[PDB]
């Protein structure tokens, strides 16, 4: 049965993936951008920053916010949703450690939309914890040869980058990118906090009093006071929502790329990156075929 | 191995479904049934505050004209994932635990007070009739719908629309409960469907213009499908753009390996209890994974019960 190479391009946006992926037998899923203008909504990501500036200057409240903003991050990560349930099915276990039939490259993973924007809009004011970890608890299972390469870019950069490149209807907001490049940080490190045997549940007690402290890990954002009883203790719901995450998290193979270079630099620096990369084998011999349809139909109707 | 019986009680409010199910309860020995209730003290305190009420609310406020047709969706939408929560938390941390059909005395009998569909199907696509919400949240929501698990038993009730109406009567928004008894009669039609061989994608031209394990195969337009005919989700040449049309295949796969059950509410309150103890004869089992799985499985609906039953 053939083999596939799933890679997931994901990490905080501006720094150059879309570039990376453009440049870049090899079937792509881009951006869903007209899901998110036309087909799913009116212009979803205006909606999100203007609601987002809105309650900085104060004329909506914190609940306002957060229904609009947990509504739209839910039309936001439907493509990669719905991509990522009739996909699933095909693909089987992993191979190992030589050649690959199909090399699909994807622009985002589910949790991209599940737990990344709305973890940012948590520290932004605009979500609540409890909207975050419902989204967390509906992160479809991780499967073998889940790759997924973060970016690596130094700020200034980035906000430079971030500028030039700005989507329709978005604002240059420098407190969400922190945000989002502080969620994406503790993200690679909660998956290598995992792997190296991290207990969350062990380890909570270090929140108030060889792997990543518990503090730089996602873990420490759900201490959020609305998760917790009285007694201070989390409420179980929110401790099984832990749970999940640890289990989806930690069998993900996390890879960084390096922004900080020409996208010549960049759109081989990801190639490099697939050699370390886990490949699976596919369920049905048609299986590679209707990926690719998916894969071609995906872009046509919502990759512009 | 040891077996495990799993049983979701749902369908539209109103019809006996907590009594009935406390009463089945109640006959089993102390620890080899346990129920897992109605989360209400997450809809009301731990996941936001008042969600039922914010529901009524809005949907009253958009039948005045108060609110928009977009406003009334942003919030049922997000009072929707906070209603779903503490079913999807529950199904993800229990499926490790379960392992394949053996055949229809458990070790362990859990009888839940609704399944995640209800949360993510059935009351977004009844708010989906009652306009409050989008037929586009609705197919997000049935694309996050967790892999339905084997051994997966659900029983719907079947009650006269005046018998219902009564019981009901004591805001009372009696298009919500055409819209919900619709909306659970096309799913219980749409499963019949999907096992009597129906392929969605062969039949969808058919459209234009229950039992669940018996009888003869319904007609598309007596299933779910229907709902999704909406311009909304139509390209430019009349076909399903294929976001949506993917949504109704994951729609397809999740419900067509469930056992699905109708118990007659139009009946006392220990006729139901029979009734029901007489339908969980055929119903399919399944063995855990580990030796452990048992217990911990009792843990987790006691704990849930404790915490947010009540
Ligand atoms: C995936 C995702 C993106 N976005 C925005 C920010 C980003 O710059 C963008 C393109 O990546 C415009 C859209 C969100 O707000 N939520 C999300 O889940
Ligand atoms: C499960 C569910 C219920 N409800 C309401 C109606 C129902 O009568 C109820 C108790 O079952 C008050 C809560 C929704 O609005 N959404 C849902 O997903």
Redesign the interface.
């Known amino acids: 049965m053939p083999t596939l190479l799933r890679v997931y391009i994901d990490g905080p946006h501006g720094m150059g993936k879309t570039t990376t992926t453009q440049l870049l037998d090899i079937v792509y899923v881009p951006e869903?951008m007209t899901?998110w203008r036309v087909?799913?909504?009116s212009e979803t990501i205006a909606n999100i920053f203007t609601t987002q500036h809105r309650l900085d200057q104060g004329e909506i409240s914190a609940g306002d916010a957060?229904?609009?903003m947990?509504?739209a991050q839910?039309?936001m990560?439907?493509?990669y949703?719905?991509?990522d349930?009739?996909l699933?099915?095909h693909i089987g276990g992993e191979a190992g450690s030589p050649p690959p039939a199909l090399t699909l490259i994807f622009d985002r993973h589910p949790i991209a939309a599940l737990l990344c924007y709305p973890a940012a809009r948590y520290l932004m004011g605009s979500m609540?914890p409890?909207?975050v970890?419902?989204?967390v608890?509906?992160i479809?299972?991780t499967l073998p040869g889940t790759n997924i390469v973060l970016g690596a870019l130094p700020e200034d950069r980035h906000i430079d980058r971030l500028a030039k490149r700005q989507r329709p209807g978005e604002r240059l907001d420098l407190a969400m990118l922190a945000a989002i490049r502080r969620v994406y940080g503790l993200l690679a490190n909660t998956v290598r906090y995992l792997q190296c045997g991290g207990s969350w549940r062990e380890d909570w007690g270090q929140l108030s009093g060889p792997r990543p402290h518990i503090g730089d890990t996602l873990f420490t954002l759900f201490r959020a006071p609305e998760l917790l009883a009285p007694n201070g203790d989390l409420?179980?719901?929110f401790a099984?929502?832990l749970?999940?995450l640890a289990?989806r998290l930690r069998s993900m193979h996390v890879f960084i790329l390096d922004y900080d270079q020409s996208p010549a630099g960049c759109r081989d620096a990801l190639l490099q990156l697939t050699s370390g990369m886990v490949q699976t084998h596919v369920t049905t011999p048609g299986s590679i075929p209707t990926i690719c349809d998916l894969a071609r139909?995906?872009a046509r109707?919502?990759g512009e």
Do not use: R
Request: charged fraction near 5%; charge should be negative.
């Open positions: 869903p899901y087909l799913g909504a957060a229904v609009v947990t509504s839910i039309t990560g439907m493509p949703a719905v991509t349930a009739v699933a099915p609540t409890q909207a970890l419902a989204f608890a509906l479809p299972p409420y179980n719901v099984w929502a749970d999940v289990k139909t995906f109707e919502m």
